[PDB]
From a paper:
Our previous reported works have characterized HbpS as the accessory and sensory component of the two-component system SenS-SenR that together mediate a genetic response of Streptomyces against iron- and haem-based oxidative stress. Moreover, studies have shown that HbpS is a novel type of haem-binding protein that degrades haem in vitro and in vivo. In this work, we have shown that this multifunctional extracellular octameric protein binds ferrous iron through D/EXXE signatures. With this sequestration function HbpS complexes ferrous iron from the surrounding environment and oxidizes it to its ferric from, making them inaccessible to react with hydrogen peroxide via the Fenton reaction, the products of which are highly reactive and are damaging to a number of different macromolecules.
To address this point and taking into account that the E78XXE81 motif shows the strongest iron binding, E78D, E81D as well as E78D/E81D mutants were generated. One could expect that the exchange of E to D would not have any significance relevance for iron- binding behaviour, but analyses of isolated mutant proteins incubated with ferrous iron revealed that all three mutants show strong decreased iron-binding activity, namely E78D up to 40.7%, E81D 32% and E78D/E81D 34.9%. In order to gain structural insight into the effects of the E78D and E81D mutations on the iron binding of HbpS, the HbpS-D78XXD81 mutant protein was purified and crystallized. In the wild-type protein, the glutamates (Glu-78 and Glu-81) point towards the central cavity of the octamer and are apposed by the corresponding residues from a second monomer, thus creating a cluster of four negatively charged residues. In the wild-type protein, the distance between the Glu-81 residues from two apposing subunits is 6.7 Å, whereas the distance of the corresponding aspartate residues in the mutant protein is 8.6 Å. Furthermore, in the mutant protein, Asp-81 is engaged in a hydrogen bond with Thr-63, which can be expected to further decrease the ability of this side chain to take part in metal coordination. Moreover, comparative analyses using the high resolution (1.99 Å) crystal structure of HbpS-E78D/E81D and of the wild-type HbpS revealed that the proper orientation and proximity of the side chains of the glutamates from neighbouring E78XXE81 motifs within the octamer are also essential for iron binding. In HbpS-E78D/E81D, the side chains of the aspartates are shortened by one CH2 group, and it can be assumed that this weakens the coordination of an iron. In fact, the iron-binding activity of this mutant is considerably weaker than that from the wild-type. The overall octameric assembly of HbpS-D78XXD81 remains unchanged and no major structural rearrangements were detected.
Numbering used by the authors:
A (entry chain A), B (entry chain A), C (entry chain A), D (entry chain A), E (entry chain A), F (entry chain A), ...: 11 to 156
């Protein structure tokens, strides 16, 4: 019987920037392809700066741990706007950073920016090492731009 | 030893709209004030269209269930861009909607829009009824604009 | 200092069948495209018969509830090898089916088979109704085969 | 048909002390303002000594990890009545303290007292370091009193 | 190297009222004793108005479901300041109340007050029916006062 | 440097009764065999009266929902010492029983007793119906005794 | 229409030993009393060897972290049949023990035995140190026997 | 009124390999028997390479922590195709591996292969040490083949 909703405006509003789903998909697929080429089996995830996972892809033959790991890696990379390889080394002086929920301070995640600000993280997991995971995440990032 | 991150651009990017924290705070505080005036004790929550909770306020004397309820109500209102009072009545023909995670199909949540699109939900819980919760949520929405 | 692992064989082993990640991706992308064409904003998920999510895609402008909903819908469809639209109607005589963990008995999920057995479920959420979600899930399934 | 509830009294009862929602809000808003001034993007949380979160504010541009981190920091500070910067250093001799649920032994949380007893913790997260988070949490505490 | 914490005062503070642990224990033990006398095997819980569980007792021979049930019942009773037997009947007109987290709208929980305000809920579970659970919860409440 | 632990005795102690792991395994395997014979694919679970799961078996080709369902069914059957087929029908007059954590009021679970008291529940899930699940659970129970 | 349940017997059954609820309560209350005497504010928990929590008591003024900590400490002590003070020191050579779910390798938990086998753990948390927590847990254990 | 589902084929499909439930059961039972012989009380788990737990067995007298530990150990062993004893030692150079969800880098888990690829992990927990747990897991693996 009743209605209707309020419309905000002016300085009550601000805008944020994101990858399109199409771009995030393009990036994630590029990571898998690079891994599949090298005979690796990986899961890939793209997480928005807002915390939401935009894309996930579970590779054929990938380990059952790789899916969530890739997700947490992307989340970690976009949160601090840095490769998870780098972030893992801050734990020497700031070891309780890993106690932050949703994070995995392990190589395989790398950020993507727009106007110098992080908009997404691309996470990979499943390769024999996180550094190799990250190589594929970079390959994922590299189709974006340029 | 290594760096650096990729910059996306062009049609790989899109923008989204949100309430400012200041506006969301202003709205949430307005809901409490309206409840406090009528002698009610409530929790209030503002949830962004992206799913993230932007503001929560636990009223003095509020029930221990009101906090999470207000959060889920705001989440529900912004998800379907409608008052939770209305959404609760769709359950007659679509009863499994309540089985959607994060939702609470109970009066007390109302949406806020920008350019005809939902950007936030304002949720309230603690009053003797959800319809009264919603009155205060509307009072919260009403300071935005106009 | 020590090793190594045991190798099973013979009737101790059996094989299972799955969609490739490439096929699951192709299907999920087809669902989004069909929704985007009709101006809808949806999340899509492909879940393997083994319970594992293989692909997720969060549409631009999709509701924050759509992601997990699509996942649970695909899981539900592949578990019972039936559209979630159909499964929702069994609740009249079997109402406690919805109490099964991981399920969402709501239109939007449809199964994919191999040799008459379910191998994947395709789930969609975000459209004004689950029946419309399911139309797009069918469009997703339809690029597979034929 | 039936009623009614029992009323306790005398030495069966005791009283506890808390910040008002208005005071907790005032403090949390003061932390954001101090961060916003220095160009930082942070989430802020005020947690009661009873464990309940009273206020949360998610700053514009804040990292998606900052919200829960600020909450756990405030919880940690009020639990031990000490800055989380200090508490993080006890881990050298008591490293399993971090294994306590709900805690984050990382700078950014500081306690607030009443009659020499902790009543609230103020947590901040999002700045380049926890020590800087804590500076803003102190600014939040500083509007209370004096 | 650094310190120290802020002290709040005046109208920045408010007081709340609670059962003592001794009183809550006395009540919970009285419920068990009444059940044990009638040959029943039950779990008992006392939950504070702030949401925190103060006391739990798992009866010998009690069902493995009774512990958490008693907890949720006490939480539900103190949240709405009413017997869970009564609250269960509001579901006819307000069926989505049960969707509130932490609740169990089933007989066995009854509130305890101080100055006309709820301070605790006493929950019982394990007897052949919730109405019988509630009888024992009332016996628990009855040693308080009078 | 320090020790040692206290030894309780007398009326401070009581004994409880359980199925052996060997018996629970024998029963669970008998359920699978009966299902496999009829061409059904099911998961089976044996849960102790204390709430602990003693045995689980995931059938080949079983649905991904069957594992947890069988567990919750066994838990439900041993909690109320009755078939879940029967317990599902109490929901007409006691519909909030399903809101008890850990439960699934759906046919497929049946209790096992010792000295007239429940000691275990045997749960099955995966067949086209819960009544058929329960037939196999009974076959599981039937190898015990007699 | 149908019934009835199977009765196991013989070597299909085994018996286990436990503290009575009365004994567990007596012990937990003794721990609080010893802490209250020394002016400490603590939560206490008694956990059965089967994993189930039998008793919890939240002290007046206790920290909001103490409740769950005491529970995990009791669980840890009864799992390994040793003081958590001792168990914390095994982490030097076996550091991944803390990664076991439900555990907290921190002083405050001590086991109780029957016939040389663990039957319960008594956990305490809230004092300025775990060693002091454990002193009170020992006082709790000491009223049992002798 | 509507139907029916799509059938995938060709290169849209791939096959995976698994232990049969019968083989997994045979292995798990062999581990228990070897432990029971040496007077040890353990829980055993077999987890598929896809992440799903196929078999669990809770030994008589086993610690309440052993069940989940064995599960996580099997999951960890099959994820990296290596004994958890070995994997625990990678933490020296890759310490954040333990932060991967679902894992427990502690001796007691060993992999089983088919065609040089991991298909299952066998996990054991409860013995005085993980190395001894692993001995029994190997005994479990050893009945498979040869």
């Amino acid at each position: 019987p009743a209605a209707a909703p309020v419309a905000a405006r002016g300085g009550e509003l601000t805008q944020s920037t994101h990858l399109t789903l199409e771009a995030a998909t393009k990036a994630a697929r590029a990571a898998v392809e690079a891994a599949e080429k090298d005979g690796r089996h990986v899961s890939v995830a793209v997480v928005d700066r807002n915390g939401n996972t935009l894309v996930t892809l579970r590779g054929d033959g990938a380990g059952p741990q790789s899916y969530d790991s890739a997700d947490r890696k992307a989340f970690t990379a976009v949160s601090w706007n840095a490769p998870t390889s780098e972030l893992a080394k801050r734990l020497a002086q700031a070891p309780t950073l890993k106690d932050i929920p949703g994070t995995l301070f392990l190589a395989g995640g790398t950020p993507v920016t727009a106007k110098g600000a992080p908009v997404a993280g691309i996470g990979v997991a499943g390769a024999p090492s996180g550094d190799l995971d990250e190589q594929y995440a970079r390959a994922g990032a590299a189709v974006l731009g340029h």
